[PDB]
Design a protein around this ligand. Structure first.
Ligand SMILES: NC(=O)c1ccc[n+]([C@@H]2O[C@H](COP(=O)([O-])OP(=O)(O)OC[C@H]3O[C@@H](n4cnc5c(N)ncnc54)[C@H](O)[C@@H]3O)[C@@H](O)[C@H]2O)c1
Ligand SMILES: NC(=O)c1ccc[n+]([C@@H]2O[C@H](COP(=O)([O-])OP(=O)(O)OC[C@H]3O[C@@H](n4cnc5c(N)ncnc54)[C@H](O)[C@@H]3O)[C@@H](O)[C@H]2O)c1
Ligand SMILES: O=C(O)C1=C[C@@H](O)[C@@H](O)[C@H](O)C1
Ligand SMILES: [Cl-]
Ligand SMILES: [Cl-]
Lengths: 288, 289
């Protein structure tokens, strides 16, 4: 007569970030575990700077197989891990940890997730030019992966905030370690932005503009910077159409929000922990 | 809804830390209770021993867990890492249940209370009377202390001359110095003393592993004629559901009770400490067969 699948044999996969309780990640992974008959459950914990160290040490002692990491912990957690994948070390951010016999390896799946979503949607940018806004965890993961996957040129735009120096490092990494050509400009350099967009096959927002507390706002100065043939992409998926995507759709452009990136960054994390492919079509149908 | 999993980012965790522990039925009990009441919690077990305890408790503080159960080998050491203790947890020196309020961890002991509640629910009134009990391990210690704190008048403990005998001596000292209960300890080999004690008791209880694997079919009772029809015979063991002791008790006409109620009511007590809602015990008993 027992109907709860969770017993004393059930193992835990975590998610540590704050705020985080409205995340769709637990639903995604729990539905995937249930579909494949795997005895795991995925839970979120509200963890910030003050809690991170103790939580990781606790997870080691609890022998957790792995967990995801989100804001504000992606760029700090490496300190508490043992090894980093090549991409996590290049990016300087971790969103996924796996525990192999007590050895914690940090991985980053946001970039690979973004690129897979483009590919699955039919958008080929390999050997071509991208203009992207942002220089935080998401943008850095995307820029590095785009370069590793063979995108030809990347023009990065960011405001002159604390992340601008990070973008400068990203430019140096891309130019020295890959065959991709990268440059950085101020987002307020509107004439350069117009030129870079014109010369690109895709324009991507990888900032929080367009998502609360910037819903209805955009970093795009004019709709006339977007020709109909341009692909316009946003990492944001709540709302499902940012102001940027709305303006692009009105101009006749193909658009893509962040739902695919969310699915694929999760699919990759799932496979790292379980060595099984996430049933993506099934999960997409029920959740995205 | 296409979504069938009840676990989301809102779901909170209640733990269980002990080793070995993965065959525990506690997670089934609490998860079925949470689901029945529509409470957004899940209960999970973790293999935690001496080497992991400090780090796990610190981690649980940082994860802001509402609470957790504790079992062997951590019940007598965990107080080191907590902030407050209930009176019984302090006196017993063991904690099986922790709750977190605004970062302050309070240790509670619920197996004794569970034992006493199960007797009351079965219609057995032992308050103001004498209990004779076999054992001096975790279960016996908690039952003896709790029984004394709850008003049992006299407790006679019987234990073999093993490494637990010294613990029983400590239990006697605690009861006689901190309560008005009159406690005494004897060797289980003192059959003539056992006859006297049982004859004078409202209840005779087994709180040892005898009667459960690797001692199934065995009993510590020397003679059936030490029992009488008015006596209550109780066993902490519930697998099997009728130990050899309970069979003999039934043969002598005694009232009997196994340890299933103790298990359920200790869970009910912890469930309220965490959720401040009453556990549906009858519902849980039915789902556990
Ligand atoms: N779809 C997905 O799976 C997915 C995955 C990761 C991140 N994201 C999203 O990506 C966005 C960025 O996340 P992150 O982790 O890189 O954040 P971060 O804090 O690491 O970086 C923030 C970036 O946004 C820029 N920015 C912030 N506010 C700005 C403003 N008012 N004007 C101009 N620029 C501004 C910063 O300069 C920086 O480039 C968030 O909306 C997040 O939800 C989506
Ligand atoms: N119903 C419940 O909820 C519940 C809760 C806790 C424990 N229990 C049961 O209580 C029993 C004891 O558990 P514990 O945690 O107190 O164990 P423990 O290891 O802490 O103590 C063992 C006790 O049994 C005695 N003993 C063991 N073998 C003996 C033998 N051959 N002859 C005489 N005495 C012997 C020891 O002297 C000691 O008093 C177990 O069977 C356990 O499953 C039931
Ligand atoms: O909110 C979430 O659930 C997540 C967001 C992204 O940062 C991901 O990188 C992370 O793995 C999960
Ligand atoms: Cl597979
Ligand atoms: Cl213990």
């Amino acid at each position: 007569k027992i109907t709860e699948r969770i017993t004393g044999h059930t193992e835990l996969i975590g998610l540590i970030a704050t705020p985080i309780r409205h995340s769709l990640s637990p639903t995604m992974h729990n539905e995937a575990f249930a579909k494949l008959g795997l005895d795991y459950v995925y839970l979120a914990f509200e963890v910030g700077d003050k809690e991170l160290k103790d939580v990781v040490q606790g997870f080691r002692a609890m022998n957790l197989r792995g967990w995801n990491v989100s804001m504000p912990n992606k760029t700090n957690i490496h300190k508490y891990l043992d090894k980093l994948s090549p991409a996590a070390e290049l990016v300087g951010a971790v969103n996924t940890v796996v525990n192999d016999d007590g050895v914690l390896t940090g991985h980053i799946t946001d970039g690979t997730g973004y690129m897979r979503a483009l590919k699955e949607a039919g958008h080929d940018i390999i050997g071509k030019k991208m203009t992207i806004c942002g220089a935080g965890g998401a943008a850095t993961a995307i820029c590095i992966q785009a370069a590793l996957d063979g995108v030809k040129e990347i023009s990065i735009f960011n405001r002159k905030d604390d992340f601008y120096a990070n973008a400068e490092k990203t430019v140096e990494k891309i130019n020295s370690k890959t065959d991709c050509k990268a440059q950085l400009f101020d987002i307020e350099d509107h004439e350069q932005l117009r030129k870079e967009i014109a010369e690109s096959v895709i324009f991507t927002n990888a900032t929080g503009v367009g998502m609360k507390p910037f819903e209805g706002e955009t970093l795009l100065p004019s709709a006339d910077m977007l020709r109909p043939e341009l692909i316009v992409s946003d990492v944001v998926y709540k709302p499902t159409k940012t102001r940027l995507l709305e303006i692009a759709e009105e101009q006749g452009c193909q658009t893509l929000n962040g739902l695919g990136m969310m699915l694929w960054q999760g699919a990759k994390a799932f496979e790292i922990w379980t060595h099984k492919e996430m049933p993506v079509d099934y999960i997409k149908e029920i959740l995205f």
